[PDB]
Amino acid sequence: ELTLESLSNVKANSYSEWITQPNVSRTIARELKSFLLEYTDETGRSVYGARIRTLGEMNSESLEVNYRHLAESKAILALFLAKCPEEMLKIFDLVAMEATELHYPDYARIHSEIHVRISDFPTIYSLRELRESNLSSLVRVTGVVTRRTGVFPQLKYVKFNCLKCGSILGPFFQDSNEEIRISFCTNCKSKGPFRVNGEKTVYRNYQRVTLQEAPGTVPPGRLPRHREVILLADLVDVSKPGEEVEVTGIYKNNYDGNLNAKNGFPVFATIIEANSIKRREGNTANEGEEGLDVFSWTEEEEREFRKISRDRGIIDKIISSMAPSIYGHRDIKTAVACSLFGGVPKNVNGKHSIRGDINVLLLGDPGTAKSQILKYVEKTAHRAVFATGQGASAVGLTASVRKDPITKEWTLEGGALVLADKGVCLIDEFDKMNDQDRTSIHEAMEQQSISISKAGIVTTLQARCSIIAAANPNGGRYNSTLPLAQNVSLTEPILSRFDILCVVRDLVDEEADERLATFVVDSHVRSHPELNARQRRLQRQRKKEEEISPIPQELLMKYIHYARTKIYPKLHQMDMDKVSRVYADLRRESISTGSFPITVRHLESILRIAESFAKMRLSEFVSSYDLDRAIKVVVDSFVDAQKVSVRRQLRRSFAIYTLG
């Protein structure tokens, strides 16, 4: 037997042969199993044991292992994995399955093999800087998905049969990029016809994708580069055409006759076999964080969620934690939080569908940090799409029709509203936009679907998306002596579809200006860029978050994701008379004096906001406090969009409902 000290010295003048030796491969497996079983973090809890426990619960087929953990301890194995992926991964999958069969015996009846997904590889390359020295090694490459072939079954253990000797050949592992070539018989001793051994075989899922370089990475004015990526089983359909992705994989080469024929030199083709996939569409928090999905939670994190969810005033802290560095504008923050958490969709007897998402509009003076709030919402949301003004078209926010280059049949392609299904679409400068482009979202805002009838395609899509829009008033500035209908160009059909409207006014006030200036100067002071040091960095970065954020942002992201995924509150016991009276009063005080369209569509927004406030508390039932808070929000959103003449009377008239 060998020791971790003995793996340092190498023989055979090649690392692959050194790894594949029988004596070395027995020490490697034992060391990998010890790493899997005995690793503990700072708090003292084994992480891979918990991951294995969750694997069986979720009926998963893959295990995620961080490269930093295996590099910090047993760094020689980390170097071996870095240089020689193919041989290390076969052993590591086997040891992973052996470790898994210590928590779930008889798990082989569910899945027969456990795959390992590597995460947080240190060195990141671009497609432009790939050379021949990276051949047969693990690489990390960012790109943009362009085209996807589709899922087909592929042979796994290939068999052959020869007729004159009737010989059956042993199973062959297919390279997945090179056809199995066999010409010699162990029995026939000569060339013979070979069959595929019809039936009695094992298949795998296979797919192929093309990655172009991201426009941001490409130097301005230069042509992009592309490469081909092969996705095997458990990795199919994860990436979608149009998204931006980061892939960790193995860089390989193969001989192509056409490439040699056209160029005129013995050049080879290259392709990447994908190992790990991470989505980066809309994510600017990629600067930090560890893992393949930063919106996923562990068991202790869920327990912490349920612990902090029962504190009184959780809603106040959640609201205060929205865009902490922006000063004031608490109504905007409340509307943003309500939109982010969202309502509950409904279907009554399978024939009547009711939408459950909140849309927000921000109409305000220039220089009031609306765009920064939109950027914060983009960063925090799980799925987010951004658009602005004249840069969007009718079919750029909807589905488009294209001729498939391969199949040559008319096909549907995605858009901004489809890329943000169960997400958020943000539209900055929503008033500086063509009417034909603006009117394309009428169906998606309410019916949450898209219908296309073009070139023989008659289909209906699904876009369960929420819209937060920012606009400027006529003349660039809001006239408080005029009603709303003469401060904007939008008509009733599009104004009715919005749930919350926030009018932002800039007024002269010495104390307010002094406080805002002090806050902004302190913020600029804070953001100036000037045990293990890598954790000293974390503690210093947490100290700065302590002042202005009641809860950390990374915790809040997982909190929002868990709340949206798991909770579905109901409305069993509530006061119908109060809501009916509020709706009737709001309808009466609109035609008499007002220019804010109120229909039945605004009655349901109160219930949606109540369900959102219930979601904020991780409660399964809506209480009276949440409904009262929703009524107060709706009433304050209507009173503050009036003329200065009647606002004082309307506020007094509507004040009886919001007694608390």
């Binding site: 692959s16 790939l130 050379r131 021949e132 051949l135 047969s136 010409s183 010699f184 230069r222 042509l223 580069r225 080469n253 001989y255 192509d256 006759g257 056409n258 490439l259 040699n260 024929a261 160029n263 005129g264 030199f265 013995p266 050049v267 080879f268 290259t270």
Partner: protein, 216 residues
């Protein structure tokens, strides 16, 4: 071992693209032109290695000129084998390869002219040093490249010169092709002039500690 390269520069006289004649094939020259297209950095096969199917004997350092060339005689004369080898892609040595297209300069172009073009091959450490739109001076050796498709490429993928566009009828039979060789068969081999370059030149950090290092 490090596959070495020798780079020559500062030649006495420079040539234009329209001075390229077949009587300088094999000579060391320097040329100037404007780059208009570059390709990817592909790996080229330099020193091949194979294994006999039956003996499992290993052959190494099989030179290749312009097409995939496998060995002929097995290392052991006891074995009789003419073909059926298996490339050991891991043991083989590779090199970087790039093809760039250049055209004539704005001044060398006559009053009325359709610009002439050329194919320049950059190899080794000289990849990506020429960017489209720039004016660069290359230096290297003028070579000639045959048509490998009719030289019997192993795979069926070439499929005997599959084409998507129609060839010129004017030069049908006018382009002098040589015949007679056994590898060709009854086919006719054709040649075209390209350039191979060994040296390229162009003729058209807020950190205080590192900044203080560079200055004298």
């Amino acid at each position: 071992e490090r596959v070495f390269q020798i780079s020559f520069f500062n030649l006495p006289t420079v040539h234009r693209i329209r001075d390229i004649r077949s009587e300088k094939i094999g000579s060391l020259l320097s040329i100037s032109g404007t780059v208009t297209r570059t390709s990817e950095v592909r790996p080229e096969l330099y020193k091949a290695s194979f294994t006999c199917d039956m003996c499992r004997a290993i052959v190494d350092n099989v030179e290749q000129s312009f097409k995939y060339t496998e060995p002929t005689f097995c290392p052991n004369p006891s074995c009789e084998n003419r073909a059926f080898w298996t490339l050991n892609v891991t043991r083989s040595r590779f090199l970087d390869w790039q093809k760039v297209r250049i055209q004539e300069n704005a001044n060398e172009i006559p009053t009325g002219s359709m610009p002439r073009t050329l194919d320049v091959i950059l190899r080794g450490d000289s990849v990506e040093r020429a960017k489209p739109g720039d004016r660069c001076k290359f230096t290297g050796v003028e070579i000639v490249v045959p048509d490998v498709t009719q030289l019997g490429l192993p795979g069926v993928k070439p499929s005997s010169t599959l084409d998507t566009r129609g060839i010129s009828k004017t030069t049908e039979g006018l382009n002098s092709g040589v015949t007679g060789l056994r590898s060709l068969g009854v086919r006719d081999l054709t040649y075209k002039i390209s350039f191979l370059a060994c040296h390229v030149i162009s003729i058209g950090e807020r950190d205080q500690e590192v900044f203080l290092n560079s200055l004298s």
